[PDB]
Paper text:
Interestingly, FliC is recognized as a pathogen associated molecular pattern (PAMP) by Toll-like receptor 5 (TLR5) and by nucleotide-binding oligomerization domain (NOD)-like receptor C4 (NLRC4), activating both innate and adaptive immunity. Flagellins vary in dimension (28–65 kDa) and contain at least two essential highly conserved domains, D0 and D1 that mediate assembly of the flagellar filament, and may contain a second (D2) or third (D3) variable domain.
Overall, FliCBp adopts the canonical flagellin fold and presents two domains, a conserved D1 domain (residues 69–167, 287–326), and a variable D2 domain (168 and 286). D1 forms a helical rod (α1, α2 and α5) involving residues contributed by both the N-terminus (residues 69–170) and C-terminus (residues 285–326), a β-hairpin domain (β1-β2) and a 310 α-helix (η1). Domain D2 is connected to D1 via two anti-parallel regions that house two short 310 α-helices (η1 and η3) that interact with each other, thus stabilizing the relative positions of the two domains. F96-111 is housed in domain D1 and is composed of two short α-helical segments at the C- and N- termini of α-helices 1 and 2, connected by a short loop. The third predicted peptide F270-288, is located in domain D2 and is formed by α-helix 4, the 310 α-helices η3, and their connecting loop region.
Numbering used by the authors: 69 to 326
Write the structure that this text describes.
Amino acid sequence: DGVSILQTASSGLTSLTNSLQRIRQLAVQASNGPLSASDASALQQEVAQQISEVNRIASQTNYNGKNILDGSAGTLSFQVGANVGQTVSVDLTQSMSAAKIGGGMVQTGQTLGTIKVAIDSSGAAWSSGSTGQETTQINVVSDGKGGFTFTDQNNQALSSTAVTAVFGSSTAGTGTAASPSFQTLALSTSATSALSATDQANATAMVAQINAVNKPQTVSNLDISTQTGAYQAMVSIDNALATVNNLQATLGAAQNRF
């Protein structure tokens, strides 16, 4: 009973790992350099096939005809001993369907993008009047709570004055796994006003990238046919794999108690 149900669930999770790991490699392939329309279409077709397999695993993994990986099994309990209350409980309340895994917040420490800028150490636009060192790039790094930390072209943290002066005062994430939430990256006009029109446009596009990568789709809605979509897929799959690994670990802990 309990041991066999746990094995059936764990088998399904291993199938799911295979398909998620496959989407990761496809996303890597799609993000390495420029792609023709035909190559982008072909790569996304492969992702769609894997999404279909994820949905099959979620809708069809079953024990004696009863689904166990679509959330519908709930919490199961098994008697292991003679003590009243000597039971092992197994939480199968979370669906593994593509619509219900991935998404969420980017894990901490990931570089979301790099913006070319022209500012002084206080975050003011660089000019012939400026002194000290010029900041020429800003790397935007996730904090695991839907917000950001920032380094310069030499990987040194921006001063707190420069962070505030360029990005405003809502950069720190406040989300939790239980209640996710997302900051909106906003770049000052002063960060790029000294640069060419083309550099200003490039920065705007990078900020849009970063904001999209910060809010990845669930596995169901991944599309790797654009660079931003491929980057969103990498984050989303990292998160989906973490969800699957957490669940595998809990199944294992339950098996151990039998």
